[PDB]
Amino acid sequence: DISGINASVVNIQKEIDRLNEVAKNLNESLID
Amino acid sequence: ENQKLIANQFNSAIGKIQDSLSSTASALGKLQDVVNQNAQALNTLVKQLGDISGINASVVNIQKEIDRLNEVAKNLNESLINQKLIANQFNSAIGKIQDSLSSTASALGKLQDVVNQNAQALNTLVKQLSGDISGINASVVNIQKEIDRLNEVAKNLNESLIDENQKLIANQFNSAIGKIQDSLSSTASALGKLQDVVNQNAQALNTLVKQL
């Protein structure tokens, strides 16, 4: 009666990658 | 005109920041869902299985914080862009971004707390049931450094507000961008650590099920 219980895994790597990508690209928005 | 350049660089920055807020809200929603799914899984295990009957994993609710991030991402459109106008639009954007940073820190703290509460619940279940399951151990997550950093940036952005003046605007803007970059890097770190611990503890629970 417990054999099917299964915890799920989470995948947010796409979102994490985008945050670092924005953090890097904001350098191009800087004003001279 | 340097005002065109400032306006365009500012508008560029806001759009990237909107992107990051939308992505943060998505990651927070996905973490909320999986945490709650795995809490339900643990509680189902306890129910199917006297000394364990009260063990209960908690659920997390950060929908208010997620909603606010998306709202700021949308409302930042009104901050898009004359020195008065630039200063006022900039100051407007900073306050919304401060709001989003405060909400992100809140959501991260609640996720940290529920993840750790449910890790303790699983470890208590293992201890009560203990040969072949005795080493199963859920890990705890520590992202307080990142949470502290978000709140500090939210606070320190007050010094980037705007009260020759193109230099002042440019320098205040550049100051804000660097702080926001700091907050984005810290958010990404906190999200990765939560992702990793959630997945570790999901594997731990699944290992417990398999052994039992």
Author numbering:
A (entry chain B): 1168 to 1199
B (entry chain A): 918 to 966, 1167 to 1198, 2919 to 2967, 3167 to 3199, 4918 to 4966
Sentences copied from the publication:
The other three constructs are truncated ones, including 5HB-H2 with amino acids of HR1 E918-L966 and HR2 D1168-L1203, 5HB-H3 with amino acids of HR1 A924-L966 and HR2 D1168-I1198 and 5HB-H4 with amino acids of HR1 E918-Q954 and HR2 V1176-L1203. In order to learn the basis of the 5HB/S binding, we further solved the crystal structure of the 5HB-H2/HR2P complex at 1.9 Å resolution. In the crystallographic asymmetric unit, one 5HB-H2 bound to a single HR2P peptide in a 1:1 binding mode. 5HB-H2 consisted of 5 α-helices and interacted with HR2P to form a coiled-coil complex. Overall, 5HB-H2 created an extended hydrophobic groove via two of its three central HR1 helices, accommodating HR2P. This groove featured with a series of apolar amino acids from the two adjacent HR1s arranging in an interval way to form a hydrophobic interface. For HR2P, its helical fold would align I1198, L1197, L1193, A1190, L1186, I1183, I1179, V1177, V1176, A1174, I1172 and I1169 almost on one side of the helix, matching the unoccupied groove in 5HB-H2 for strong hydrophobic interactions. In addition to the hydrophobic contacts, we also observed a series of hydrogen-bond interactions that would contribute to the intimate binding between 5HB-H2 and HR2P. Via the structural study, we have shown that 5HB-H2 assembles into the proper five-helical structure and binds viral S via the canonical HR1/HR2 interactions. It is worth noting that the HR2 region recognized by 5HB-H2 in our structure is highly conserved, such that the amino acid sequences are 100% identical among SARS-CoV-2, SARS-CoV and other sarbecoviruses.
S2 subunit includes heptad repeats 1 and 2 (HR1 and HR2), which mediates viral cellular membrane fusion by forming a 6-helix bundle (6HB). The formation of the 6HB fusion core is a key step in mediating viral entry. Here, we screened a series of 5-helix bundle (5HB) proteins and found an optimal 5HB construct (5HB-H2) with broad-spectrum membrane-fusion inhibition activity. Unlike HR2-based peptides that cannot bind spike in the pre-fusion conformation, 5HB features with the capability of binding to pre-fusion spike.
